[PDB]
Design a protein around this ligand. Structure first.
Ligand SMILES: [Cl-]
Ligand SMILES: [Cl-]
Ligand SMILES: [Mg+2]
Lengths: 225, 204, 195, 233, 222, 195, 125, 211, 195, 195
């Protein structure tokens, strides 16, 4: 579950922290929030390797472009470069991204689908939990939201995904990008799913395991003398 | 037919107080037939340990490939590669075969030589990174290892305690998988000593 | 549901605002009316990605054309769309209506189906929702209509297309192309549903 | 084994302190064509039960006839047909569940998802689901098709657990249902603005509302959206 | 085409003590990535101190449990109210399952109770009726996560006496009901963390000479 | 199907290979030698798809012979095995992979130790006391697990191999028309006529 | 057309001098002064902004360039040749290092890469 | 892995106890020998349910024969009841590989292999190694007709151990049965984990392992 | 293209006259308006064979109904059509509109899609050609129209359906059902094409 | 695959049948007798799908034995062959046909003549001097087409059969583990131990 919510003086994006292989939870605290540039972040859904690779490549080219032009990078640039790359590979690179950021032009919120299509909105959601998240956004979103209101709305939309979507879970990661300010990355903004103490300590008595052989491993280089 | 379960095998890594542990089974098979019980799946490039499960031809190929790349790194950098940096190199190397990938499940373990901070990571076959605090699992008995680790593990275990936990996690997971077992190895890794132990286990 | 209608003072482009994956509405405020030049616009139907990719290349081609040869004709814009659509027919799912205002040629509409064929028409309809209004549009279209008449004709037409098509919906966006300039109109459900 | 032709979309429902609410839109879609408007998909059985049906409409009309026939049959040689031996929600459900599982097991299913809402004799709220596979389950909130994905998340914020049901009034419950129907109109490409809503209360009985419309919609923000990224006009 | 089968997820666990037995399951019912119910029982009292769960396709599991409940009713009628022994129940369920051999019940069946000597018993079945008596069994989606834990912690597998270096196995012992409940809770807590189809709640049915009692514990709802 | 077995004794490596070449229900030959001498102290036995087997072995033979002339040195079996594995590991992701399974038997003059390597068409390599490819491997492994001893003599190794072939003849459903046996020791590679 | 200059334009002279490299070093000598000093807790690089015209905005011409967040560069000699080297240096830091190891290159290895680009303009056709 | 061979001292029956679902090991304590009657044994290979159900049914049909004819059923007759039943279901997807072993005065020690394909064969030795049925043992070298009962038991136990080690789908424990005149005798269940190490140490075999 | 429209004095049934195999017109003078009772008629779309077989059974069922219970209701005729269509859904491709005049109920229209579902409607359209006139018919239909108005509405509607549909064509057949009796109307291409 | 051969000499019929039972890559038996005595002077050899072969032969054996008891007479081989063919000819159009190929060797006491019949699973029947089923057919046939003589004796027939088996062992790719030979003459049916 990834959402983006535009507000009065900026844009906020949030995501859940679960990655799944089939029905198994691979990572309980995944990071789906990616720095393309200092004030341009995006949230990714779909193939985990694809979203990381595509944000790192464009983030690299955006940094070289920024240095070449002597200008802070623009969201429309990262957007354009991402969609032309994804379109080239005809959806075989399964990267579904919500791209937000503030630049000299103002605050921007876009979404990018793996076939190379983009769209503009005040509120967006993507992934398996998008329908749970969009249901909350369509119920509580208004024009002229404050910063506090937009964080509340964004995290609530992720909670909807965590609770009602099997593909989403664990914690809520938020990133606030306000005009004329530093982007604040709030890693584990909420911790709604903390495991309880086990009934038993499964620490074994020493010598429990049968050992055939033991040996010192040489990790040091060839020695002197 | 499914490349990632022809040969079989498992790897598991865990963090403790000022230490890490990585362990693997020793089986190589052609599906039902067991061929070799000496097929170790854990390799080390300096103080960084890499376990690889999956298609055995790719396990061997990636070991030879990462030995190659870490050797050139050390000659140019004039220092051994660190776990955090090697993790990024594995990811990079897997994603460059996006549309023709190595059928492998790599696991990185090691202690950062400067910060002393224990580090573990796992990857999918195209190089997505799972950087867990607690434990990483890989192979044909990954479901079984997730079950064992999730119940047995507690944080800040001493080296000799962590050994018992990871050993019991591997042994009991392997015994519930047809394509895993035929012996096991456990590496206990501290900042400047590494002990390697072969475990007695059932050979069926 | 997309249409372009040529009237006395120029041309008007109409479209619905719905984008779908299966039965889920991915975007309910979609802008399917896109600028390839100051007074050359297109209506996009089919794949969102394909039409966006094609529209971006055509805008590039006309920006470079303008640099060298000055303002391109609507016919020229249609030709560039056709060239991309025909030569890449095997790999593209795109149905595009090209509408533009010259001062010499006044309002012109060109339609480009899947094949990549070109058809110059007094007006054109396209999209899944277009099939339900073929009968209505053919009976109600006159040449040299006023602006008010042409806005009504499109509003009523897309109103019906939205009603019967699950794939069409949301707001009715329109773009008026005349000598006077470029006007954007929006019509909300409460307005066009009661027609 | 067949394929559904004329189909109905989401049925949504929830429990509240004194009863249950259920709702469904009045559309019969022929694929992408929104062909039949004014199709009623909430079918009341006596004054204590409403059966909401999604999926194939021909199969719905068959089930409608089975229920009409069930009321007739129950009255036969039954002096307490309008009292102690009236049809209970639990009886009507178990019958449909039996039929659904038998039809799937002959590889000729009734291509539907069904929610039975009602109040029992002792005043207990009844709400249970069954579909073309004969799969059954109960929950403080139930929904079919798109409703499961979009309505449940919203309704579960009012009633998350059993203990929340006494704390939920009919005004709060109806508000939640009406909002969920608006969200489904925004986001389901097979929904209509026109819907029916039914309340079954242990005190006030069965209230059936027809020709309800989704209102207080937000579209004004659309005017400010131009192009798919770089377009400014 | 029309597919007559579905997957409703969930996990069931049966442990047999010396003079008791437990059958536990999560209360979560799912289809695909949606949650159908956070509380929908899957462990039933079937009478004659027998608890039964059929886990997999919920429709097939509900039907089978009904048929066995009916089967118990007709045993009493036809055999002068004879108590149905767990071994007799197990054999009856095999015949129920094998009846649909060429259109199987897509479920994993576990029944718990006391044997005729009063010792705790668990029986496990495959979809087509193959059955065997066991000390421990986990069924459903998260079976692969839980069974290895139970092998290690209930049967003391791969555990040796310290100082023997694998020469002498850890002595097998009967666990108390309190110890067994802890293992059940720990197993489900662990399975909930790593399995998307497991969570919401845990319902445990304990069987003793005195009868059948029920314990419920909340699980993570993500 | 084709039988190729390898056993490594105390001081030598013995390779037994079936002499029958069959394509379908036809026996093409009963005296086929499925072996190539890579170097004076290295022998390779191969089984697999028709054409690929000989082409791959002769290609490997040429490369190892080229290395020997260029450096006036014999590559160690470990080195030869690694070269062969890598060629196979390249071929799996090639347009048409070589479908060849090989056994490499060599005597390492530097370590004065015999070595046996099993490599499959994917480039899967292991060092083993005894090895085999195909249906025959299932049976022979279980037999060798019981009887094989690491300090066995060449004569003891031949007797065990003789037992394996006899048991394979009874148990196997296809007629492999006997085996050719070759010994690799310090003195070189010789063929055992009596078998 | 085609680049028909496939041969070296820098060769050894009978005296064992590479003329074009010596002449390049002569161009550097004519260039404005730049310096660098290394302290215990930092490094400083400095140069003069020799403005071609007072009408020219000298702020727009950057002689001191960021290569990575932890590496800066200054030059003496031909400005255009520096500007394209800074572009190639910034890019090679990414392509040959950061896109592989996920961190910026150490000073000595980025220098090694810039050095390689300059060696090739000394031997290539 | 199921093994049944004939010798002077009667019939030796040895089976493993592992059940698998794909690569998943469902059970290590499965009973693959069904005791039909005091003199009759059935081994189970293939579908667990198919073998359990129909061999249990065979025991019922064998019991009825005894009642109706006041005599023990012949191994030939008992085998053919099962073989004729499965032949009716031929092509329906029954998976069954089974050996019916007993001693009767009329026939002496007898082993019949009965298949889900409808194959019924009489032989001195039958072995089912995952998916494969053979007329020879996993070793077959040690097999001579005149063997000690306690010596013959070990061969059967050793033969299951061989297959258990190499075959991924075989393992758990070894169940041993000795069939003679006046009934069969259970020779206990031997865990392969414990057995392997002991056998290795005593026999000096599995040298390729290491321990 | 088939439609049934209920007006003040009763109901009118309209249909085109084209039957096709692929793109070949098998019959260009088809009568798709069929009698199941004196004042109960149906419109047949889908398989020619299926609709003819179903219509024949219904006519039989209503003839036997009339013998025993007197003139059946339009609702009763619709129910018999539904029963055949629903219970044989797996083996039938039939879309039927049932129209009839009672003196008690006046004009009634029932539509039966593929599923075998029943829908009572003020008017109904069906067939491949119906999709093109959904927009037109919804905008132009009023309740309690005159005979002349209703004939015009159907003539104009099917005129459009024929124009855009390859499967529709030929003459426009109509059947008027009132108290006055049963009137057959035919409209030729030269008449309805110039509308 | 399974070898069944038949040769009819001057005064007897000899049947040679392979002794191996194989399913896939497993050999179930090496002493299998693929023959049933239908009557004292009639023998049937069968090859085909597992289960079907024995079930069919035993079914035919029971029917022929029933006829013998009922009439206290032996059916002629011609009559027995016709009965067997007809049972197979019924089975091809049955729900699950018997996949069995048979050779029928009999001595007709009325005509004092030996007869050989070849019947395939379809119910195709011919009377031949020599016959065979499967892959071993093409070889043996051509060999026998050269050596067989109508007035050969039983001893001469056995030598020719001995040659056929020897040549089959070399030429065939599968191991059929030898043959069992049975002679049918006036004195009855006997098994030749030495072969
Ligand atoms: Cl778009
Ligand atoms: Cl017709
Ligand atoms: Mg719509």
């Amino acid at each position: 579950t990834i959402v983006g919510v535009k507000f009065n003086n900026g844009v906020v994006i949030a995501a859940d922290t679960r990655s799944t292989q089939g029905p198994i939870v691979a990572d309980k605290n995944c990071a789906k929030l990616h720095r393309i540039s200092p004030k341009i972040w995006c949230a990714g859904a779909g193939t985990a390797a694809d979203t990381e690779a595509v944000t790192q490549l464009i983030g690299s080219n955006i940094e070289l472009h920024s240095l070449y032009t002597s200008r802070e990078p623009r969201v429309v640039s990262a957007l354009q470069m991402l969609k032309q790359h994804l379109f080239k590979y005809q959806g075989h690179i399964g990267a579904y991204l919500i791209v937000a950021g503030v630049d000299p032009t103002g605050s921007h919120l876009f979404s990018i689908h793996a076939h190379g299509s983009t769209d503009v909105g005040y509120y967006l959601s993507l992934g398996s939990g998008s329908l749970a998240a969009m249901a909350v956004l369509e119920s509580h979103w208004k024009q002229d939201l404050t910063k506090e209101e937009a964080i509340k709305l964004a995290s609530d939309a992720i909670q909807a995904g965590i609770w009602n979507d099997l593909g989403s879970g664990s914690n809520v990661d938020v990133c606030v990008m306000e005009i004329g300010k530093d982007a604040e990355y709030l890693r584990n903004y909420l911790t709604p799913n903390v495991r309880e103490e086990k009934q038993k300590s499964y620490k074994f008595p020493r010598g429990t395991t049968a050992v055939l052989k033991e040996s010192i491993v040489n990790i040091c280089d060839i020695q002197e003398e | 037919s499914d490349p990632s379960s022809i040969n079989g095998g498992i790897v598991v890594a865990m963090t403790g107080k000022d230490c890490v542990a990585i362990a693997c089974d020793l089986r190589l098979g052609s599906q039902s037939l067991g061929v070799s019980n000496k097929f170790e799946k854990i390799f080390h490039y300096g103080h960084v340990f890499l376990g690889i499960t999956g298609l055995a031809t790719d396990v061997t190929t990636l070991n030879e490939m990462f030995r190659y790349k870490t050797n050139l790194y050390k000659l140019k950098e004039e220092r051994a590669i660190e776990p955090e940096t090697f993790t990024q190199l594995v990811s990079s190397s897997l994603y460059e075969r996006r549309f023709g990938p190595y059928f492998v499940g790599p696991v990185v373990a090691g202690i950062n030589s400067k910060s002393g901070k224990p580090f573990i990571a796992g990857f999918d076959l195209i190089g997505c990174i799972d950087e867990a605090k607690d434990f990483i699992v890989s192979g044909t008995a990954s479901d079984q290892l997730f079950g064992m680790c999730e119940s047995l593990y507690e944080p800040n275990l001493e080296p000799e305690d962590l050994f018992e936990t990871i050993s019991q996690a591997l042994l009991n997971a392997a015994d519930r998988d047809a394509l895993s077992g035929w012996g096991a190895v456990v590496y206990i890794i501290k900042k400047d000593e590494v002990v390697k132990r072969y475990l007695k286990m059932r050979q069926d | 549901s997309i249409m372009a209608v040529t009237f006395k003072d120029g041309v008007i482009l109409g479209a619905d605002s719905r984008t779908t994956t299966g039965a889920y509405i991915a975007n309910r405020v979609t802008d399917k009316l896109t600028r390839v030049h100051d007074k050359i616009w297109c209506c996009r139907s089919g794949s969102a990605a394909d039409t966006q990719a094609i529209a971006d290349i055509v805008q590039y081609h006309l920006e470079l054309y303008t640099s060298q040869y000055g303002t391109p004709s609507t016919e020229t814009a249609a030709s560039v769309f056709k060239e991309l659509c025909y030569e890449n027919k095997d790999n593209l799912t795109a149905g595009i209506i090209v509408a533009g205002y010259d001062d010499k040629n006044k309002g012109e509409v060109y339609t480009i189906p899947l094949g990549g064929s070109v058809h110059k028409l007094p007006y054109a309809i396209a999209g899944s929702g277009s099939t339900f209004i073929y009968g209505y549009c053919d009976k109600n279209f006159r040449e040299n209509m006023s602006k008010e008449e042409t806005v009504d004709f499109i509003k009523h037409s897309l109103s019906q297309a939205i009603k019967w098509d699950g794939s069409s919906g949301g707001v009715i966006r329109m773009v008026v192309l005349t000598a006077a300039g470029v006007e954007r109109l929006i019509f909300y459900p409460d307005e066009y549903e009661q027609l | 084994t067949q394929q559904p032709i004329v189909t109905g979309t989401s049925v949504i429902s929830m429990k509240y302190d004194n009863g249950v609410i259920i709702a469904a839109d009045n559309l019969g879609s022929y694929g992408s064509l929104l062909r039949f408007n004014g199709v009623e998909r909430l079918i009341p059985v006596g004054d204590n039960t409403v059966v909401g049906i999604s999926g194939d409409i021909s199969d719905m009309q068959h089930i409608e006839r089975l229920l009409k026939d069930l009321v007739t049959e129950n009255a036969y040689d039954n002096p307490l047909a309008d009292a102690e031996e009236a049809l209970e929600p639990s009886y009507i459900f178990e019958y449909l569940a039996t039929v659904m599982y038998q039809r799937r097991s002959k590889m000729n299913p009734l291509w539907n998802a069904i929610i039975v809402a009602g109040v029992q004799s002792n005043g207990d709220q009844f709400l249970r689901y069954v579909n073309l596979l004969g799969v059954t389950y109960s929950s403080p909130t139930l929904a079919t098709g798109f409703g499961a994905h979009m309505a449940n998340p919203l309704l579960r914020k009012v009633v998350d657990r059993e203990s929340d049901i006494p704390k939920t009034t009919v005004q709060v419950a109806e508000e939640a249902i009406v909002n969920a129907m608006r969200v489904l109109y925004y986001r389901d490409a097979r929904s209509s603005r026109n819907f029916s809503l039914a309340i079954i209360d242990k005190n006030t009985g069965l209230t059936f509302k027809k020709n309800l419309q989704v209102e207080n919609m937000k579209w004004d923000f659309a005017k400010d959206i131009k192009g798919y990224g770089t377009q400014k006009i | 085409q029309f597919n007559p089968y579905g997957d409703n997820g969930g996990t069931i666990l049966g442990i047999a003590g010396e003079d008791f037995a437990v059958l536990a399951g999560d209360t979560r019912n799912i289809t695909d990535y949606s949650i159908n119910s956070r509380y929908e029982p899957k462990v039933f009292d079937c009478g004659d101190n027998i608890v039964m769960s059929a886990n997999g396709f919920a429709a097939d599991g509900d039907a089978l449990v009904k048929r066995f409940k009916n089967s118990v009713k007709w045993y009493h009628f036809d055999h002068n109210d004879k108590k149905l022994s767990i071994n007799s129940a197990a054999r009856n369920i095999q015949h129920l399952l094998y009846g649909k051999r060429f259109f199987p019940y897509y479920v994993h069946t576990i029944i718990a109770g006391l044997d005729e000597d009063g010792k705790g018993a668990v029986y496990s079945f495959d979809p087509v009726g193959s059955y065997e008596r066991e000390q421990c069994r986990a069924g459903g989606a998260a079976a692969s996560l839980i069974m290895p834990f139970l092998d290690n912690q209930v049967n003391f597998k791969n555990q040796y006496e310290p100082g023997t270096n694998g020469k002498v196995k850890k002595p097998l012992k009967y666990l108390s009901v309190e110890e067994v409940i802890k293992l059940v809770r720990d197993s489900f807590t662990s399975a909930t963390e790593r399995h998307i189809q497991v969570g919401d709640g845990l319902e445990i049915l304990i069987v003793t000479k005195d009868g059948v009692r029920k314990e419920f514990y909340e699980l993570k709802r993500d | 199907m084709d039988i190729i077995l390898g056993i490594r004794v105390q001081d030598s490596v013995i390779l037994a290979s079936s002499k029958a070449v069959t394509r379908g229900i036809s026996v093409l030959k009963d005296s086929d030698d499925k072996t190539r001498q890579l170097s004076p102290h290295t022998l390779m036995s191969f089984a697999g798809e028709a054409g690929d087997t000989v082409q791959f072995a002769e290609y490997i033979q040429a490369n190892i012979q080229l290395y020997s002339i260029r450096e006036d040195y014999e590559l160690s079996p470990q080195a030869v095995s690694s070269f062969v594995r890598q060629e196979l590991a390249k071929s799996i992701r090639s347009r048409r992979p070589y479908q060849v399974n090989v056994l490499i038997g060599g005597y390492d003059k530097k370590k004065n130790k015999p070595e046996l390597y099993q490599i499959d068409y994917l480039g899967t390599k292991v060092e083993l006391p005894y090895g085999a490819h195909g249906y025959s491997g299932f049976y022979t492994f279980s037999l060798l697990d019981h009887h094989y001893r690491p300090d066995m003599t060449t004569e003891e190794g031949l007797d065990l191999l003789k037992l394996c072939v006899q048991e394979l003849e009874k148990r196997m459903p296809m007629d492999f028309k006997g085996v050719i046996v070759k010994i690799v020791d310090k003195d070189g590679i010789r063929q055992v006529d009596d078998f | 057309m085609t680049d028909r200059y496939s041969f070296s334009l820098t060769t050894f002279s009978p005296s064992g001098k590479l003329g074009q490299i010596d002449y390049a070093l002569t161009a550097v000598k004519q260039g404005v002064t730049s310096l660098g000093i290394k302290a215990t807790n930092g490094v400083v690089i400095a140069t003069e902004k020799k403005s071609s015209s007072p009408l020219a905005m000298s702020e727009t011409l950057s002689k001191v360039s960021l290569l990575t967040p932890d590496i800066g560069a200054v030059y003496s000699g031909m400005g255009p040749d520096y500007r394209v080297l800074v572009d190639k240096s910034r890019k090679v830091a990414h392509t040959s290092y950061k896109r592989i190891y996920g961190e910026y290159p150490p000073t000595k290895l980025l220098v090694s890469e810039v050095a390689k680009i300059m060696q090739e303009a000394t031997q290539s056709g | 892995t199921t093994l049944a061979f004939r010798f002077q001292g009667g019939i030796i029956v040895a089976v493993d106890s592992r059940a698998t679902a794909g690569n998943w090991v469902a059970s290590q304590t499965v009973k693959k020998v069904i005791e039909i009657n005091p003199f009759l044994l059935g081994t189970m290979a293939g579908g667990a349910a198919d073998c359990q159900f129909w061999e249990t049914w065979l025991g019922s049909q064998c019991r009825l024969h005894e009642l109706r004819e006041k005599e023990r059923i012949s191994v030939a007759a008992a085998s053919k009841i099962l073989s004729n039943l499965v032949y009716q279901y031929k092509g329906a997807g029954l998976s069954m590989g089974t050996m019916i072993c007993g001693y009767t005065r009329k026939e002496g020690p007898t082993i019949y292999y009965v298949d889900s394909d409808g194959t019924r064969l009489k032989g001195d030795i039958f072995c089912v190694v995952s998916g494969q049925t053979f007329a020879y043992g996993v070793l077959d070298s040690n097999y001579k007709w005149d063997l000690s009962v306690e010596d013959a038991l070990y061969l059967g136990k050793r033969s299951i151990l061989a297959a258990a080690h190499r075959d991924a789908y075989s393992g758990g424990s070894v169940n041993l049965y000795h069939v003679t005149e006046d009934g069969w005798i259970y020779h206990g269940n031997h865990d392969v984990g414990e057995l392997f190490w002991k056998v290795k140490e005593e026999e000096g075999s599995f040298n390729n392992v290491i321990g």
